[PDB]
């Protein structure tokens, strides 16, 4: 819809600041850690794969979790309950056919009741004040993909893969905005596959250069290189599939040359 592409981009850039979680919230959580969050997000990747959910839905749920935990202290035994209600809310927002409540109870391995999941749904809504239409890494990526000459499916899937990996690790990715991470991921994918760089037209569109993307791009390069050794492996397994052109099997570059 070329009549609104600029208006939408501008609006998403405004909303992503307003929807940004608190950067240092984990320091303030007495019972949970970055490592425990990493386990939850990886589990949500599996649930998404199990029920054939959109990648958008997964990105939305993670945003809801991070915003919830920005103000609400949660014990380790209740973290999975927050995650389940968040994923249920994201499914209701984003999916044509969301899985029913019973199905979300089943995948918790009977840890929680139907009543508990429903009560948590209601609480997450109160805490987020029903503000669920948040911009994601995904929403920026698909706009950035339109600037390919020409369109490359390996580039697209590898950018989606890298953006997904950023969801796992609160340190350091909580400090970067969705549009910046999408920038880092798009350049890194485009460089790995074709040798090309962050294009001139996206500089005009976004205001971002390689210079401004450098810090996020430096972290994301390191996450990419160290991906086979990471404790959490569901994203790598997911992106082995031909649906995503087996992009996780590609070799990361050794240097970026910035």
């Amino acid at each position: 819809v070329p009549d609104y592409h600029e208006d939408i981009h501008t609006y998403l850039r405004e909303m992503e600041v307003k929807c940004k979680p608190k950067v240092g919230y984990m320091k303030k959580q007495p019972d949970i850690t970055n490592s425990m969050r990493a386990i939850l997000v990886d589990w949500l990747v599996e649930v998404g794969e199990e029920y054939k959910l959109q990648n958008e839905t997964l990105h939305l749920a993670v945003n809801y979790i991070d915003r919830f935990l920005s103000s609400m202290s949660v014990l380790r035994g209740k973290l999975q309950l927050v995650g389940t209600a968040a994923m249920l809310l994201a499914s209701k927002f984003e999916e044509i056919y969301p899985p029913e409540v019973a199905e979300f109870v089943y995948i918790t391995d009977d840890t929680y009741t139907k009543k508990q999941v429903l009560r948590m749904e209601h609480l997450v809504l109160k805490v987020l004040t029903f503000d669920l239409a948040a911009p994601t890494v995904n929403q920026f990526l698909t706009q950035y993909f339109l600037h390919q000459q020409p369109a490359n499916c390996k580039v697209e899937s590898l950018a989606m893969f890298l953006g997904e990996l950023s969801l796992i690790d609160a340190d350091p990715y909580l400090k970067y905005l969705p549009s910046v991470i999408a920038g880092a991921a798009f350049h890194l994918a485009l460089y790995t596959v074709t040798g090309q760089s962050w294009p001139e037209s996206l500089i005009r569109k976004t205001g971002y250069t390689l210079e401004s993307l450098k810090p996020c791009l430096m972290d994301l390069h390191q996450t990419y290189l160290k991906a086979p050794q990471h404790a959490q492996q569901s994203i790598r397994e997911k992106y082995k599939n031909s649906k995503y052109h087996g992009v996780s099997l590609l070799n990361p570059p050794e240097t970026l040359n910035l």
Binding site: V1, Y4, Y11, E56, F93, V101, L125, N138, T142, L146
Partner: protein
């Protein structure tokens, strides 16, 4: 929490829940209360979509969400109150008709509200006279975002069922993988014609009936008028090939500028179909004012 509100009467039922006229006891403000019972499956996706999207969309031609009251048992949405809906207004205007300055004004305002929706990545997907609300001061507003959704750029495949049959775009009927902002324009085009004639432009009772009615008015589309049409999932080579009728006969009272705008709103190809934003600058609107409705509401 509901203590300061006094219900007056039931207004009706939309996509989900029930709408009541009410009065704020303290401020005096007349409101509309949308009651949802959670007697199940949690909060419905329709309520989740309407609330989140409307909290973003502050505009004079979009019905204002004032508050959300969230009890253990019930969920109440507090809306601004409007006096009448466009359908009931068109029925009451049967004898006198609707004055052309009022039709022009209403269309201009509706295109403003729609342009705002689309600029904020929101598709309404249920535009029809019932969902268009009017006050005594001459305002018209988009209402019921229960079937609305937040879209991405470019679009994915979304729900197929969408839009009440009479106002449903041909790309939905022919089962295109992707639809976008153009579906809302199609619906408004239908409503534009309906404001002039005071009867629905394409009143079909099935999907195939709806298409054939559209074809008899605009001509059966080919690859020349709409590239890719013959390859669409629900296109049939056996479709009768009707000629496009003179556009001055579709809506006879309409002037040259009116007819020009309507044709662009009812263009077969979604890409060629005029945007709400671009339609605001159409010569039809050169002499637009904002008159009050000619009838007590």
């Amino acid at each position: 929490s509901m203590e300061n509100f006094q219900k007056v009467e039931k207004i009706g039922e939309g996509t989900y829940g029930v709408v009541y006229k009410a009065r704020n006891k303290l401020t005096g403000e007349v409101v509309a209360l949308k009651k949802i019972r959670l007697d199940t499956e949690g909060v419905p996706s329709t309520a989740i979509r309407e609330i989140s999207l409307l909290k973003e969309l502050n505009h004079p031609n979009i019905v204002k969400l004032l508050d959300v009251i969230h009890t253990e048992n019930k969920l109440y949405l507090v809306f601004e109150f409007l006096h009448q809906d466009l359908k009931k207004f068109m029925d009451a205007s049967a004898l006198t008709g609707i004055p052309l300055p009022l039709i022009k004004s209403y269309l201009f305002q509706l295109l403003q509200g729609l342009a705002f929706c689309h600029s904020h990545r929101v598709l309404h997907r249920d535009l029809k006279p019932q969902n268009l609300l009017i006050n005594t001061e001459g305002a018209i507003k988009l209402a019921d975002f229960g079937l609305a959704r937040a879209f991405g750029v470019p679009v994915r495949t979304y729900t197929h069922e969408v839009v009440t049959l009479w106002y449903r775009a041909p790309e939905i009927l022919l089962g295109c993988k992707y639809y976008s902002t153009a579906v809302d324009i199609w619906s408004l085009g239908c409503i534009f014609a309906e404001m002039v004639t005071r009867r629905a432009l394409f009143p079909g009772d099935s999907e195939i009936d709806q298409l054939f009615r559209i074809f008899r008015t605009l001509g059966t589309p080919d690859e020349v008028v709409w590239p890719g049409v013959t390859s669409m999932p629900d296109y049939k080579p056996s479709f009768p090939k009707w000629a496009r009728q003179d556009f001055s006969k579709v809506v006879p009272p309409l002037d040259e500028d009116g007819r020009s705008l309507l044709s662009q709103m009812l263009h077969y190809d979604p890409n060629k179909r005029i945007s709400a934003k671009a339609a605001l600058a159409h010569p039809f609107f050169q002499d637009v004012t904002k008159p009050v409705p000619h009838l007590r509401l």
